[PDB]
Amino acid sequence: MREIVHIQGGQCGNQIGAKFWEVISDEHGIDPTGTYHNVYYNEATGGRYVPRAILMDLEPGTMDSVRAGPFGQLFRPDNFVFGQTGAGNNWAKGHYTEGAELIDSVLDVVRKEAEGCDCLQGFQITHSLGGGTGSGMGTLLISKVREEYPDRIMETFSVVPSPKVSDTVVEPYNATLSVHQLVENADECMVIDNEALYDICFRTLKLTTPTYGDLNHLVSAAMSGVTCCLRFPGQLNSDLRKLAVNLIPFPRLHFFMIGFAPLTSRGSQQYRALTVPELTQQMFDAKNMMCAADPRHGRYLTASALFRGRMSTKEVDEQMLNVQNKNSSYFVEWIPNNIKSSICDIPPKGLKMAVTFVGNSTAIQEMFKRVAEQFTAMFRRKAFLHWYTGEGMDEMEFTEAESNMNDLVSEYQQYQDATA
């Protein structure tokens, strides 16, 4: 009855998954041993609960990572598949030679996991787009599972490479090669980039030393809020599919933007009484979203907002109307009433009000534009290309991937500029 498996991949995807599982355990009142104090968890002998997630990676370091952190004993060893080498920041080493011999096995651990459910609402993936392991394996797996279960939807909670603050030197190749395939067999590519996460955690919470734990926790909160209106009753309920129907007008404009609310520090926490219009002003601000792309620089094709807690639905709908009507320029004309709302009934742990905003908006083609810029700059000289062409990859697939990327961005531009 509308269950969700949680496939992971790569080190970043694995850390995000561990954080998300422990946050969900916090919301659903579970302890790090799996005892109470069906959509996500599964029942197990002795009243125990085990998450319905698989954990794949080539390097066994992330194994000890998800063991060390709390709530690591919730998972089951049958879902700990792990290689030995680690693609070491090489895309093809997780898509053709070394990654392949794992995906097969992973298929097994999916096929004796999906059929475990009875009415599966779809999958969801958590991985990176630059790291070879995560990107490559997740792309191959998206391929296989879309070949297997085409009827269900597969959200991809992807973290695109940090555009300007790069930590590796082979991001563009991996990102382009992966997006070329993700645009085909994916349905909800919600992009995240550490630039925006540091921006938020600096200029909205004044925190001292932001480690990856805090960014993972924030993305966890957003991930939970995305489907909590499904997990719980509400005055106006939604799901993983109503979002898709109300968010994409064409089978390939499905790349989203994520935003969470509210977020303040103790100083600002003392002030600013909590009320729905303040939440709207916080969610529809530019820099308050998980993507380093000022949304004013594009138009919102469409945008949904899920509220959590108790409120007055008239206030919600009236604020939505006021905000889509006053700033008519930043919104798109040829589609009317392009905003969407939904309301749950159980807010998070001690948070009287919570908003999760998901928006399909043509203001995110700039990210792909600049990533493809870096790519085509590093490809005209065939730089760092032997590492790939030595592993069966040719040099035509790169041109195909870049041309598909440019076709996607051209689609965004073309059907943004359209009129009625």
Partner: peptide, 4 residues
């Protein structure tokens, strides 16, 4: 919260 557990900010710090």
């Amino acid at each position: 919260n557990t900010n710090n």
